[PDB]
């Protein structure tokens, strides 16, 4: 009908990338408060029924590999997939401790033709990162 | 017959393109705090887009950055949802 079919053995995998520390050369600072977000998210997503996994201080190669391998597992018995990124960022990019990597390249591993088992299933990505250096001043 | 490769993706960004996203060293980021809060209360009975719409409101209203600098003082934030979903999404039943 009009709703994604949720009648599967399991709801799905929930991958959390908790980037807090970065290499001095990237010029990025510690992201205090991120563990607070990481624990809240994990508790919250476990209650929903996801099998959540938390990763910490990941390099770009690690983030890429991590997600590539997730897109290659067998999701046949899962209702959907969810990934949450917590790190520094700039328009279209997310930071690894290593440096910088495009968000599109991270999510592409799950396109319909590269992850046949998540086909016709919702692929969710929540992202906590900056996307430029502009400040919203507000109104009224 | 076929389905687009970019279909069934949903992206929930903590902020719109080109802007900053705020985070508290003792509380956490605004977007995540809000998301978790709404999910606790309605994860099981609200459509995904209803939950994120409510998260947009909460971030836009409740918060305001308190910093001792005219530039970073009392600034706002509005989350951004990009949807390529082709169905309504409920996390239960």
């Amino acid at each position: 009908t009009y709703q994604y079919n949720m009648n599967f053995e399991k709801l799905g995998k929930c991958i959390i990338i908790n980037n807090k520390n970065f290499d001095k050369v990237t010029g990025m600072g510690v992201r205090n408060g991120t563990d607070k977000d990481a624990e809240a998210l994990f508790k919250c997503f476990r209650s929903l029924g996801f099998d959540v996994i938390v990763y910490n201080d990941c390099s770009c190669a690690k983030m890429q590999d991590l997600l590539k391998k997730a897109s290659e597992e067998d999701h046949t018995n899962a209702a959907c997939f969810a990934c949450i990124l917590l790190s520094h960022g700039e328009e279209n990019v997310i930071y690894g401790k290593d440096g910088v990597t495009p968000i599109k390249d991270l999510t592409a591993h799950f396109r319909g033709d590269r992850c046949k088992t998540l086909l016709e299933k919702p692929k969710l990505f929540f992202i906590q990162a900056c996307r430029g250096t502009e400040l919203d001043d507000g109104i009224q | 017959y076929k389905i687009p490769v970019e279909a069934d993706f949903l992206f929930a960004y903590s902020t719109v393109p080109g802007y900053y996203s705020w985070r508290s060293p003792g509380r956490g980021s605004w977007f995540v705090q809000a998301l978790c809060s709404i999910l606790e209360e309605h994860g099981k009975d609200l459509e995904i887009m209803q939950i994120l719409t409510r998260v947009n409101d909460r971030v836009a209203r409740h918060f305001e950055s308190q910093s001792d600098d005219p530039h970073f003082h009392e600034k706002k934030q509005i989350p951004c949802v990009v949807s390529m979903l082709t169905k309504e999404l409920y996390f239960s039943q």
Partner: peptide, 4 residues
């Protein structure tokens, strides 16, 4: 608050 700080930014990300």
């Amino acid at each position: 608050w700080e930014h990300x």
